[PDB]
Write an enzyme that holds these catalytic residues in place. Structure first.
Site, short mmCIF file in Angstrom:
data_model
loop_
_atom_site.label_atom_id
_atom_site.label_comp_id
_atom_site.label_asym_id
_atom_site.label_seq_id
_atom_site.Cartn_x
_atom_site.Cartn_y
_atom_site.Cartn_z
N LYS A 230 21.57 18.30 22.57
CA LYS A 230 21.95 19.47 21.77
C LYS A 230 22.42 18.95 20.41
CE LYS A 230 21.86 22.45 25.30
NZ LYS A 230 20.94 23.62 25.33
N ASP B 160 32.43 26.83 31.89
CA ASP B 160 31.93 27.45 33.11
C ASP B 160 31.72 26.43 34.23
OD1 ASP B 160 28.67 27.99 31.43
OD2 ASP B 160 29.98 26.25 31.59
N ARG C 224 11.27 25.70 24.73
CA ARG C 224 11.93 24.72 23.87
C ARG C 224 10.90 23.74 23.33
NH1 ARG C 224 17.42 24.79 24.25
NH2 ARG C 224 18.38 25.75 26.09
N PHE D 112 11.43 32.06 46.05
CA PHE D 112 11.00 30.67 45.99
C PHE D 112 12.10 29.71 46.42
CE2 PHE D 112 10.71 26.68 43.46
CZ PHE D 112 9.59 26.15 44.08
N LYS D 113 13.28 29.86 45.81
CA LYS D 113 14.39 28.97 46.14
C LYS D 113 14.96 29.17 47.54
CE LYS D 113 15.43 28.55 41.23
NZ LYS D 113 16.42 28.58 40.11
N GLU E 117 32.53 32.32 33.52
CA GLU E 117 33.04 31.79 32.26
C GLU E 117 34.54 32.00 32.13
OE1 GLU E 117 30.34 34.06 29.75
OE2 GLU E 117 29.00 32.31 29.63
#
Ligand SMILES: [Mg+2]
Ligand SMILES: [Mg+2]
Ligand SMILES: [Mg+2]
Lengths: 4, 335
Positions: free
Chosen positions: B36, B108, B211, B304-305, B319
């Site tokens: 980042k 978080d 990205r 899926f998971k 948060e």
């Protein structure tokens, strides 16, 4: 699209 | 104290604490700041009575439409956050390091939600965002609070991925391999190129953004092959799907994925099986498949998971906001  | 990033000795001590802590998070590693690179890093820590680091928080400062910065410690701090008195002291150091430039310091941590903990945090002055905020949109939490986590410690003698599942699932996992799918892994430029092709294809197919490749190149430059690994699934010369996993602290984290159009021969299942195998081979405690929108078959992510995580999804506290500039906070943050 979020997320690292 | 605030970490002097130009002091090699100080950095190494900070890194050793992060990498060896059971609370370590790759997003709290100093390497994350390198990924980042468009954010400003500010890192602080606390020492115990013997001068050893006992808690640390890596923050990244970002811009807002106001004159204040947004301070964020993704999945931090690194310590037992339920030890709120210690947390207050670490945050005090962070607040001093921010020097009034941010309107809020948000963190978080991956700690289970509970009314008790939520209330304690509020009692100490923090503003929490969990069950009280929108599930999605510009108001939702940055990180999903519901995550599919496989606790490998429940299977001490497991040798392979298959040993963790019921027969119905062993069948699903074996299917891609039976049909010719093969998976190779590493962290070289070649694997990154293969990942990027599936990642961009996937985004184009869904009509969503993605990205830039430089993001992942910085990631590869920041983490070695024992921390970052790209899994590539192919069938007889054809690229099918890929996934990126990061091993840090007590877990291996399934972070990114890509898949080509058309018939993929359940390659995504093969990728998952190999990532899990890596966790087993390295005696890692947890395999984290990431977030879901809801514990419903209506959510493709969950379906899926849920194949790999039969236990209930973990629900995090969300948060925790240390409000510094109340007016700007109210302007930029709402339920
Ligand atoms: Mg601004
Ligand atoms: Mg093992
Ligand atoms: Mg399971």
């Amino acid at each position: 699209x979020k997320x690292x | 104290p605030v970490l002097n990033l130009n002091d090699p000795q100080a950095v190494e001590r900070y890194e050793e604490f992060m990498r060896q802590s059971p609370y370590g998070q790759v997003t709290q590693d100093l390497g994350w700041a390198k990924v980042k690179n468009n954010w400003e890093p500010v890192d602080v820590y606390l020492e115990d009575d013997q001068g050893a680091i006992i808690a640390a928080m890596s923050m990244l400062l970002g811009d807002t439409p106001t004159d204040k910065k947004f301070a964020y410690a993704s999945k931090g701090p690194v310590m037992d956050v339920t030890d709120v008195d210690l947390l207050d002291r670490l945050v005090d150091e962070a607040v001093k390091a921010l020097d009034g430039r941010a309107y809020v310091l948000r963190f978080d941590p991956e700690v289970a939600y509970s009314d008790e903990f939520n209330t304690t945090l509020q009692d100490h002055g923090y503003v929490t965002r969990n069950r009280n905020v929108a599930d999605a949109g510009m108001h939702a939490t940055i990180q999903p609070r519901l995550n599919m986590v496989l606790d490998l410690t429940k299977f001490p003698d497991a040798k392979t991925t298959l040993d963790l599942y019921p027969s119905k699932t062993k069948s699903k996992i074996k299917r891609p391999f039976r049909d010719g799918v093969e998976v190779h892994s590493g962290n070289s430029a070649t694997e990154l190129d293969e990942f990027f092709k599936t990642y961009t294809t996937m985004a184009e197919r869904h009509g969503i953004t993605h990205r830039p490749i430089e993001y992942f190149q910085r990631m590869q430059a920041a983490f070695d092959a024992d921390t970052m690994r790209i899994f590539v699934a192919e069938r007889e010369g054809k690229l099918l799907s890929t996934g990126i996993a990061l091993k840090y602290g007590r877990k291996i984290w399934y972070m990114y994925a890509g898949s080509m159009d058309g018939n993929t021969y359940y390659a995504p299942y093969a990728v998952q099986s190999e990532m899990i195998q890596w966790a087993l081979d390295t005696n890692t405690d947890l395999y984290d498949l990431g977030g879901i929108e809801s514990e419903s078959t209506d959510d493709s992510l969950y379906v899926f998971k849920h194949v790999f995580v039969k236990d209930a999804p973990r629900e995090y506290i969300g948060e925790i906001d240390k409000v510094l500039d109340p007016e700007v906070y109210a302007e930029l943050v709402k339920d």
